[PDB]
Design a protein around this ligand. Structure first.
Ligand SMILES: CC(=O)N[C@@H]1[C@@H](O)[C@H](O)[C@@H](CO)O[C@H]1O
Ligand SMILES: [Cl-]
Ligand SMILES: [Cl-]
Ligand SMILES: [Cl-]
Length: 499
């Protein structure tokens, strides 16, 4: 009875592990007449309709959303110790109530509810149920404010609908930021009016050749809107000065030798560079960041800065000193890969650490020092949270430059004491990047993202006190029937006792 258990799943059996779980009493049961009662506000109703849409297919129930009466499922906004993202979930025969200070908290509460319900909830046709929700109370708040997932749409382009699909995958685990790698050597994915060829030419292909693609302003705005509806703040990235071949191939003048390189369809990195000694280079950067910032309601703008190996150190430093201010000029907070820590991060900047266990002390020191100087840290170790990394030598997709990364390794660590000498309060959170050199379709994205994606989300959300592999793997194993019913392919790691 994997699909429709006789009894409800444990109240604590959810990912991320909730801050506080107090089981008790009888469970709630959703029946054909259940109403979803929300506050008389747009934001409240919005979450109600979202919940209704998630449950209608499998239950076949009407589930009307209204601001009157005593619905069996109540979503209420009230004062409380739940911050901007926390919530309280009360379940019992009298009904299920989700309380939070803001919509995001209610949304997060819903993500927990869909896990309390049985696997059959993932089906698209009416199911027998029962639609039980374990009884008791859950009080939940996040450990870190930066819990993101990155999707590389430059190596292989993924359209609006495919991105919306990935957004729904991550929303399940309370991620609150979506980092989009919009440009690299194999493609430029965002239309820039001031530089038309970036998209029309720079976006014409991708890894392996053939058609590429890109987002028009309208498509990008739609992705941001959809992400916002799933409470994901979009963090766009335009990598510079390295990983810039798409742009360089589009405009000969940007190149040091004034010759446009061919469009790149390989899978290597580090060979491209904007010409730091040219003035046109900074007109280009200003134009792009200005247009991107206008399309970005979010607070951050990622300028990359990784593997600028065709850019001498001194030039890299000079380049970043010159471009960082451009971000603030357009009202945004700059973010960069940790290489930026060696190029004087401006005040308020954050750096994304993608180092490994084996990374040299000198490099780790430079990053820990930036943290001491006030730079916020986003942790995404290549040998931990890079979802494109192979599980073992036999994985049919992904890369292995950072070694292999099985499920336990990806989960078994603590962000607070990860980087030696780095102040714990400098750690803003974590990120799970999914690079696409080897992934060309949504199903392949799923196979590499799952089952590690949920784990990284827990590291960003759950209290350190709840972290434990032996008990987490049981909660992870329980997701199997849900993913199977949802049509979500995943790697059945031998380290997990799959349900
Ligand atoms: C910051 C960063 O990760 N840069 C590259 C990235 O462009 C590539 O897609 C990935 C694949 O694992 O390898 C990294 O070294
Ligand atoms: Cl989904
Ligand atoms: Cl090559
Ligand atoms: Cl390489």
């Amino acid at each position: 009875d994997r699909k429709a258990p006789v009894r409800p799943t444990p109240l604590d059996r959810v990912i991320p592990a909730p801050a506080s779980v107090d089981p008790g009493g009888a469970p709630y049961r959703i029946t054909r007449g259940t109403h979803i009662r929300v506050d008389d506000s747009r934001e409240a109703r919005r979450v109600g309709d979202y919940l209704a849409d998630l449950l209608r297919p499998a239950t076949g129930y009407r589930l009307p959303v209204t601001a009157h009466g005593h619905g069996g499922i109540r979503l209420r906004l009230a004062g409380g110790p739940y911050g901007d993202e926390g919530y309280r979930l009360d379940s019992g025969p009298a009904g299920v109530t989700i309380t939070a200070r803001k919509a995001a908290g209610l949304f997060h509460g819903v993500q927990t509810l869909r896990q309390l319900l049985p696997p059959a909830v993932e089906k698209d046709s009416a199911q027998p149920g029962p639609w039980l929700v374990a009884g008791g109370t859950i009080e939940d708040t996040p450990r870190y404010a930066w819990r993101s997932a990155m999707l590389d749409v430059s190596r292989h382009f993924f359209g609006v609908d495919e991105v919306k699909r990935y957004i729904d995958r991550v929303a399940r685990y309370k991620y609150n930021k979506l980092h989009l790698h919009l440009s690299d050597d194999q493609g430029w994915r965002i239309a820039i009016d001031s530089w038309p060829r970036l998209a029309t030419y720079g976006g014409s292909t991708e890894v392996g050749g053939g058609p590429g693609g890109y987002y028009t302003k309208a498509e990008y705005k739609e992705i941001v809107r959809y992400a916002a509806s799933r409470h994901l703040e979009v963090v766009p990235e335009i990598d510079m000065p390295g990983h810039t071949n798409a742009a360089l191939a589009s405009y000969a003048e940007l190149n040091c030798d004034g010759v446009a390189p061919p469009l790149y369809t390989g899978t290597k990195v580090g060979f491209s560079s904007l010409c730091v000694d040219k003035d046109v280079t900074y007109d280009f950067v200003d134009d792009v960041i200005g247009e991107l910032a206008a399309l970005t309601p979010g607070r951050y703008l990622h300028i990359g800065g990784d593997e600028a190996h065709s850019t001498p150190k001194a030039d890299f430093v000079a380049f970043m000193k010159r471009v960082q201010p451009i971000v603030a000029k357009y009202g945004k907070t700059v973010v960069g890969w940790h290489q930026l820590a060696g190029a004087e991060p401006v005040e308020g900047a954050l750096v994304q650490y993608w180092g490994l266990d084996r990374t040299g002390d000198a490099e780790k020191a430079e990053v820990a020092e930036a943290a001491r100087n006030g730079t916020g840290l986003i942790l995404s170790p290549a040998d931990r949270t890079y979802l494109d990394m192979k599980y073992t030598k036999d994985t049919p997709l992904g890369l292995s430059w950072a070694g292999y990364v099985e499920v336990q390794r990806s989960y078994d660590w603590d962000p607070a004491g990860y980087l030696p000498g780095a102040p714990a309060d400098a750690v803003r959170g974590v990120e799970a990047p999914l690079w696409t050199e080897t992934l060309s379709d949504p199903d392949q994205l799923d196979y590499m993202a799952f089952p590690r994606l949920p784990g990284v989300a827990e590291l960003g959300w759950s209290p350190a006190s709840t972290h434990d592999w032996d008990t987490y793997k049981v909660r992870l194993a329980a997701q199997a029937p849900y993913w199977e019913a949802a049509g979500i392919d995943f790697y059945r790691s031998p380290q997990v006792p799959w349900t």
